[PDB]
Design a protein that fits this description.
Chain B: This is Growth factor receptor-bound protein 2. The complex is a heterodimer of chains A (7) and B (98). With 7 residues, chain A is mostly loops. Chain A contains no helices and no strands. Chain B has 98 residues and is of the alpha+beta class. Chain B has one domain: SHC Adaptor Protein (2-Layer Sandwich). The radius of gyration of chain B is 13 Å and the shape is globular. The chains are: A little secondary structure (7), B alpha+beta (98). At the A-B interface, loops of A face strand 3 of B.
Chain lengths: 7, 98
């Protein structure tokens, strides 16, 4: 899945 | 007033990556509407030769935030991050696209 630096 | 130069609407994560890797300055950014999570906003920023994505969070009181400081609008979150790093380990200060 897409990833986020803050999650 | 003038529209904001940082709102791109619903563009693919890949397209944001594409256009941002072509920017010359660190901090170059754009706000987009997440295609993976409808109703969510994503902040894409360039740093060095890298491009990172941040999810704009919203809490129980309806406020926006990246880490701990909360705001009432995307406008204020963005403006606040022009002088406060968007990352906990790199100093990435938002700067308008060019």
């Amino acid at each position: 899945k897409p990833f986020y630096v803050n999650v | 007033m003038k529209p904001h130069p940082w709102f791109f609407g619903k563009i693919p994560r890949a397209k944001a990556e594409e256009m941002l890797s072509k920017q010359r300055h660190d901090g170059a950014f754009l706000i987009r509407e997440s295609e993976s999570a409808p109703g969510d906003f994503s902040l894409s920023v360039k740093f060095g030769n890298d491009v990172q994505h941040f999810k704009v969070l919203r809490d129980g009181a309806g406020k926006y935030f990246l880490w701990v400081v909360k705001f009432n609008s995307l406008n204020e979150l963005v403006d606040y991050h022009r002088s406060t790093s968007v990352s906990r380990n790199q100093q990435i200060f938002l700067r308008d696209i060019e």
